[PDB]
Amino acid sequence: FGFLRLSYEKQDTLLKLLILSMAAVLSFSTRLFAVLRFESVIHEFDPYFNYRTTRFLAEEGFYKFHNWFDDRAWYPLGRIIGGTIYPGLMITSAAIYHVLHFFHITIDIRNVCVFLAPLFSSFTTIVTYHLTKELKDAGAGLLAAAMIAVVPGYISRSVAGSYDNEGIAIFCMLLTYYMWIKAVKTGSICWAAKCALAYFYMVSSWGGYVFLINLIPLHVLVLMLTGRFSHRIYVAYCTVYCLGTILSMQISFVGFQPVLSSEHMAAFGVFGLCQIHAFVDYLRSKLNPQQFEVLFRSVISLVGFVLLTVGALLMLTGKISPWTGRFYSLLDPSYAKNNIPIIASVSEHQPTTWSSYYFDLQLLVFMFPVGLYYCFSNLSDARIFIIMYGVTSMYFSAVMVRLMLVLAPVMCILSGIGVSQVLSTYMKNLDISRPDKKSKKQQDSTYPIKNEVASGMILVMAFFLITYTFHSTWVTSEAYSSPSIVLSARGGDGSRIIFDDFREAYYWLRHNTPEDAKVMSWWDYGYQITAMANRTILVDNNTWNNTHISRVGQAMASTEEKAYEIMRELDVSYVLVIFGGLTGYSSDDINKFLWMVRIGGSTDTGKHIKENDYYTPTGEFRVDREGSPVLLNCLMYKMCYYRFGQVYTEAKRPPGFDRVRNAEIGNKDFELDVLEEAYTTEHWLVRIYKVKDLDNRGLSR
Amino acid sequence: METLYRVPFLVLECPNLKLKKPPWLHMPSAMTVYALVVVSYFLITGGIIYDVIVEPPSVGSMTDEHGHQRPVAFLAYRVNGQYIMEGLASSFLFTMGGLGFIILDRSNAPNIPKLNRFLLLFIGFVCVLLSFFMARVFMRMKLPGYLMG
């Protein structure tokens, strides 16, 4: 009876604190699997670029970082780092780092970046509970926080060591929505100002800000069509638009896109419409209805013609830029595949399958409709926005696998609402929990089993919830805990053997080559080489220049003599290629060879390169004796398979066999006229060749 | 200009035109929109968009020492690859599970006959339990090591 004597207000608050506190602990802890199993290192290719920038900003100061121009990348063109980057992620890391040192807590910058992502996941959990509470109740909010904490889809990009923009982008997005919902619901300017400020913070953090600037106009427009438009909506939306537009423009990278791009036009159009709608209502109330029709018709005819002419003129003249390639694809799926090879090339741009949805979300997929049904049943202005957020995310998540992360937040909140409704309804069905007010007479004799029905329904729901935890734990441990830079292989004895070839090659270059040497490689590895090798590179992941990449592709795909001519022009010193045949590493260059062929031929200079030439007469890509003659004599084939014919990969297979393609190389013996072997890793994962100079005697090489 | 159109109608009988808004064309009801969304959800989770871009066969083929071409429904060992038949079959299960709860909720309403209430409950549990349990089997076949440690 000790718990009973406490006031109910005490009981509710105490449980609320305990549930939220635990959820934060779980969110942070679950992301440490990689750091424990493997070394505390930066993961993936993109994060390294952020890591290098973060160090430069902290050591050099903000002002120097703002104007930083990097000459070590995209040689000889160069890149302007200050104006082509998003500063949000770097600024947050630097600011915390300064504070910790200020108190004499000396921590490495590398540690700060590695552990930045888990901490924010805990912050995201708190924001989720408040946003859900506003829509329905506290009970739903506690459910949402639990689901968001362990959702695998969010975990994939937020694991410890994943220093990527996505880690902070999600938290900013939820906060901005939470401010927006309060701004509309309360109708207060103060909330509107807070919402705009949060929006600006997101704009710096990520490049995905565009999604928000279109969804919010869409929500307002639907309310107008449905007749729910009110003074509160006018103040909240209009106030945010003005401050948000100016704030976003401050970022150097965004520049003038908000006012000149066709991407941001939707927000501008809705803003103009709101003024017209508000003014018309004010006139109607003051004026006599009979007269009002005469003025109303005359005004519409004159204004409508003027507005239509202005809009047509802007589009036709081309003052407003057409949509960017990246966004056009997201809408029209076919456009990217048929028109832009580079966008198709990326491996996270593929459409999503059913297996992907279940693997990332599991139970939530079952519960997503239930949340939708309740929201439709009880229509509210705040609720309308969440429906818009859901139904769009589903469409944009199928088109691209990467956008799954955007889907994960909406999925957790909506699924929680469905679970909350089911739990409350049946639980109060269980009279034992509450006698409350009951009438024995007219009790519905169509009912024999009240005690049993509720007990079974609650029990089954609990079973589903526990299973969700188990699935989420197993997937994260087995899927998202692998560092890309370090590869795990099993030995014959079954021991865990670690392959460190990727770093080993970088270290060799770092100390054993001239400082001014230029290294040529595929654009995939541009960030990694610069961060660790500290040597100049020709191409980078950002791929700001398509023509430069295409020229690189031509050299690799071409014959040995032609490739040499291109390389000399660019002052290439070394070439790095990754070969996985010995170890069975699937993601080698040879699999990526085809993309090189298409990209190389995309430009005018690469017209001579035809994809069909590299295939067998039957349309097959093979590296064996039956392979196309052009393929066997291309630069890439020679580099990967130089001296590889005589190596025994397997006891059960003849020498010169390639394990990953499961085929034996057709051309086993050949010599490199213009290239010499500089260094090869122990497992041959990375091979480095040095460019030979011209002939001393002038003989044709 | 109007006379020119009259010239055929001098001999021909002019059609009697009533340019009124069609009666059936009403603003969609809130329930109507929800139904439309649900069907769309079925297709999107099914990977219809994946099918259009990638154009996989409905079913593939395999072989053994006994030889001969087994049809294949599940694309083994690659999470981001699917066949046409497999994607739709999985998607339907997901929709069914959601509906099972809604029908169960409606069954709880007061003033329902004894026979009606019992029958409705049976359907609700069958849809929910089969939909969830079957989905686990489908993944287990696609990835043999699923949830195995």
Partner: peptide, 26 residues
Amino acid sequence: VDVDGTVEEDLGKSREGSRTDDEVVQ
């Protein structure tokens, strides 16, 4: 025979970002 060490499979490679598609042929 020459060396030992067979790699495992990356059950969840797909999430990796800014990386080239290593399955066009398949």
